[PDB]
């Protein structure tokens, strides 16, 4: 079937101890290995395997921090989820070109590019979109991403 | 000077004195060179348990994260001095935890509970019946003297020695103990190879193979009190009392060994050599033996010579200038550290301060 | 006399029969010589110790270590160390009734496995050159071996101990000439040695 | 003292005594040098199935995990007593759970006397009478620990050496540890393995010399420990005086026995080479006088005797330890300075020990 | 082609003389030194070669004893057999970051690791799913063990 976003709560209460395992670690392989994260991820989840990659590429985003990434409802009047690229956009912190960087990488680089810049960013989004989009993490996301981005960008300017 | 140093060479035969999860002897690399090793822990749990240290010392503290066998033991050891809901109250505000008779209990970690403590505290909790403070209230008086509840410690001594790490209940602001006992790990003073002993258990109606790993070596214990610390833990007790508790520690080092696989591997051996120094700063003699002493005529002869010499370096390098004695049973005789032919002699020089 | 530490490539040492044959290739006709495996199989090949009438001569598959030409002088009631691997047994006819060539019963050599047996073979064996003065008789697995080409099998015992000189000659003998069965396949060479 | 401390030096050729995985002699490197040695459990089983011990001690506690050996053996012996089910329902609950005959298996091996077996079948009337649920037994002999101890005067073995249960009911009423803590056995000085042969053929040819160090037999240094008081508790609380009885068996047993077909080197001129008994508040073993030594002279026995009582001179004075202690020497060496009674021979020893030193 | 389970029975049916010495043996290439190997091994075979090294580790795996591994056919109900994670993590013996440094290890240092850890635990398992795990012994089977354990003892 699919994750729900009990994930993001389930991140959200773990104990420092573990969480201090997941969040020490340099790449989403490095994380298969520690116990921590098959404990965690058992409900979601491991082994059906369709979605072991979504999880490792989920739980290494989340891995960032414990409110690195906040989790905000889309408002009734938007009727959509703040996303991403606007997320990363609207805080400002983010310089555009280690984002093009983001859409150049390739396997497990893109991955440890993105961690490093929700730290940095410390970004509001709807968790779900980044969710769906790193299930799939296809072109079209990673180019949906930087369009989101500059467009945002722009419209703030 | 504050700081007591006491150093031991002790020699054992064939034993596994000390082992892992897997049974497989302890050990540590040192100078490049293996050495079997016994844990501070296990000598430190050695001393509290054994024979000399209740004769001396007294009371060993109960270590467990079982409250309701706790519950039961008070209520049975104060039950007669107390009321039964007293001692529910006092242990709920010292760990932090409920009491429903529900035979589970549930400790976060495994804490030193000394008796006497408690019963201090019950004496406490009663003038609850005067007012009742909020338990909040009671922590501010309590915060205030620290000291009250170290003199109850003189019962229990080993956690003044070792110390205690509180987590939970009213222990975090009050039962936080450190020092003032520092003790290394246990080492051989050269390289030991791990004999295999392959043994079988013999079926009279009738083949099964097991193995165990022992060692035979020489082994160097260093440890360190720092007696301001210990007459701060003990409720400011005499530097004069606090130099006996030392002794005791100095006598229990040259003579106590764990006792893991005894019945088997009887390795009941006393010290070859101890040396005691009184000092401003700590010292070990570990360095005397990084370069791993060669067997002469055996291990421990050349063993005491490199510790001799060792610390004749650092002591010309070092300039230190302290109280000094050392026993042996081997005479080379230092250049200048005073000679005790017996442990008792040590052990008095000791306790007159090293003078 | 010469005594020397060979090795064996381990391509032409894997059956216990190939090893003389590649000892063989040492020289230089009926054998002169008796050796002791070491160490069965490393990297490099099989470790043996070579007691011979020849210099060994270096080959592709055998290789020499080094060599001593040694001439033995012995003294007389002067006590020694000694090894020797030796296949102590006993020649019998036969629990099963199975008979080969000329068609009458078949005989069988069979292991003395009880240490009582195996020392008295061994102070028997040696007799009036040397006194066993004292022996450990160590088990040592069977070994086994191909052809060619037939099936066999040698249980060894390694007798590791001191023992007294009452005869030289006898004794030197004994050595050049080794003791007991399957000299062959690495046994019976007497190694003697000082206290 | 509630300690008594046996030392013995008793020789013998290092031979056959006790074997490795590959049937070499059991060795340890004490001192940096390479000793033989014999395992505790070797000394100990020799002594168990002693001929001595089953005339002065009593009958040898038989270990096995074969249970269906064992309810034969247990049904033939106790079958006086009325029923076999009642037996094989003790077994059942002491070890769970046994069916006819069949091969089940116990968990591991561990000691069974006869004795308590039949005081179990004794106890299980309680069945019928309350009638009591096996659990309620359970916590109604828990109450009583003592009282099946005393079925360990056959079966000391036991009480000796100790037995742990894994399972069943033994768990609860069967935890038996001490009383004897026994060295595994160590020679006084080098003998020598792995000799380069190679190099051992250069010193050989004289040729014209004709010229060493003298042969040698064996010599083991034996060390044993026993608590009195763990023993009284491990027999059921009994005579001091007995448990003492049972010590000089031991120490007989000590000073005497060889394993695998051998004897003393000096059997038949004497009892015992070395033996001393010391009586102590502590455990205390003299290892370490052999640590150094010992280089021969002559032969091994004279200087490790010697060797030994220096060492016990300088411990007996540096750690002031005034005790009860006895030697039997027939070698004349320099003998002890301290307070030690000399015994002409070892049943005088063995007298001395009975009566607590005296 | 591949290797049967025939050679877990034919481990279990050696004589004693020849598993003494395979036991006898502190890594696996050293495994390859001794005869009684060859000889075990001729038959599945020695060598493809490409089957070499998985018949090492099986070989230096079953070394630990007779009843050290105990062969238990798969329950028509579980679909699989129980595994060498479940196992070990079952018997409650083994302590995970044994298992971890495990996950940790390198070539021989791997197996020597490993075969103390199963004569501590004597398991039960299901004989080819160990022979299918070290016939590749990737990082992925590895990952799989620590999965196994740390899922079943929570369970």
């Given at each position: 079937e699919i994750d729900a976003m009990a994930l993001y709560r389930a991140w959200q209460q773990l104990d420092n101890g573990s969480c201090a395992q997941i969040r020490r670690v340099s790449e989403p392989d490095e994380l298969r290995d520690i116990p921590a994260f098959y404990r965690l991820v058992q409900?979601?989840?491991?082994?059906?395997?369709?979605?072991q990659q979504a999880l490792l590429r989920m739980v290494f985003c989340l891995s960032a921090g414990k409110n690195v990434i906040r989790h905000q409802d889309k408002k009734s009047e938007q009727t959509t989820g703040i996303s991403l690229g606007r997320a990363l956009a609207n805080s400002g912190r983010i310089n555009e070109r280690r984002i093009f960087q983001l859409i150049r990488a390739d396997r497990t680089a893109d991955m440890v590019q993105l961690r490093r810049l929700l730290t940095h960013a410390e970004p509001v989004l709807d968790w779900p979109l980044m969710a769906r989009m790193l299930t799939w993490w296809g072109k079209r996301e990673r180019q949906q991403l930087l369009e989101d981005f500059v467009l945002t960008t722009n419209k703030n300017a | 000077s504050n700081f007591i140093n006491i150093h031991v060479l002790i020699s054992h035969s064939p034993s596994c004195l000390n082992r892992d999860d897997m049974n497989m002897q302890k050990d540590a690399i040192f100078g490049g060179k293996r050495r079997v090793r016994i844990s501070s822990q296990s000598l430190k749990r050695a001393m509290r348990k054994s024979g000399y240290y209740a004769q001396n010392i007294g009371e060993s503290s109960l270590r467990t994260i079982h409250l309701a066998q706790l519950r039961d033991v008070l209520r049975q050891k104060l039950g007669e001095r107390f009321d039964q809901k007293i001692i529910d109250k006092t242990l709920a505000l010292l760990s932090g935890k409920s009491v429903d008779e529900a035979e589970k209990i549930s400790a976060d970690a495994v804490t030193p509970w000394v008796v006497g403590e408690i019963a201090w505290f019950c004496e406490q909790v009663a003038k609850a019946e005067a007012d009742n403070l909020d338990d909040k209230k009671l922590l501010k008086v309590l915060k205030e003297d620290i000291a009250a509840i170290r003199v109850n410690l003189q019962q229990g001594v080993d956690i003044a020695l070792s110390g205690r790490m509180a987590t939970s209940g009213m222990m975090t602001e009050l039962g936080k103990v450190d020092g003032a006992m520092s003790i290394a790990h246990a080492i051989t003073t050269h390289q030991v190879d791990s004999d295999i002993d392959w043994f079988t258990a013999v079926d009279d109606l009738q083949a099964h193979l097991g193995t165990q790993e022992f060692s035979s070596g020489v082994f160097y214990r260093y440890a360190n009190i720092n007696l301001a610390q210990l007459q701060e833990n003990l409720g400011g007790a005499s530097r004069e009392q606090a130099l006996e508790i030392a002794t005791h520690v100095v006598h229990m080092l040259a003579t106590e060994v764990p006792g893991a696989k005894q019945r088997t591997y009887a390795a009941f051996n006393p010290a070859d050599m101890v040396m005691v120094n009184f000092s401003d700063m700590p010292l070990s003699m570990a360095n005397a033996f990084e370069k791993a002493v060669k067997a002469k005529d055996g291990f421990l002869q050349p063993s005491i010579q490199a510790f001799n010499q060792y610390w004749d370096r650092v002591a010309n390098g070092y300039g230190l200038n302290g109280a000094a004695a050392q026993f042996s049973l081997?005479?080379?005789?230092?250049?200048?550290v005073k000679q005790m032919p017996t442990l008792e002699q040590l052990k008095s020089w000791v306790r007159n301060n090293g003078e | 006399m010469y005594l020397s530490k060979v090795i064996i490539a381990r391509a032409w040492s894997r059956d216990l029969y190939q090893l003389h044959q590649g000892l063989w290739h040492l020289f230089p006709a009926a054998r002169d010589f008796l050796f002791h495996v070491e160490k069965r199989n490393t990297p490099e090949g099989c470790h043996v110790l070579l007691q011979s009438a020849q210099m060994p001569v270096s080959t592709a598959v055998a290789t020499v270590i080094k060599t001593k030409q040694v001439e033995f002088q012995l003294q007389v009631g002067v006590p020694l160390y000694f090894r020797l691997r030796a296949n102590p047994i006993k020649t019998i006819l036969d629990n099963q009734k199975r008979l080969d060539s000329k068609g009458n019963i078949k005989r069988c050599r069979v292991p003395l496995i009880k240490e009582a047996e195996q020392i008295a073979w061994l102070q028997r064996k040696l007799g009036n050159a040397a006194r066993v003065e004292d022996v450990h008789p160590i088990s040592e697995r069977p070994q086994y071996f191909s052809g060619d080409g037939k099936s066999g099998k040698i249980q060894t015992v390694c007798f590791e101990g001191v023992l007294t000189i009452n005869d030289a000659p006898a004794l030197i003998d004994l050595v050049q000439q080794?003791?007991?069965?399957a000299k062959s396949m690495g046994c019976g060479l007497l190694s003697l040695a000082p206290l």
């Open positions: 409900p979601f989840g491991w082994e059906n395997p369709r979605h | 081997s005479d080379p005789i230092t250049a200048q | 080794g003791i007991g069965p």
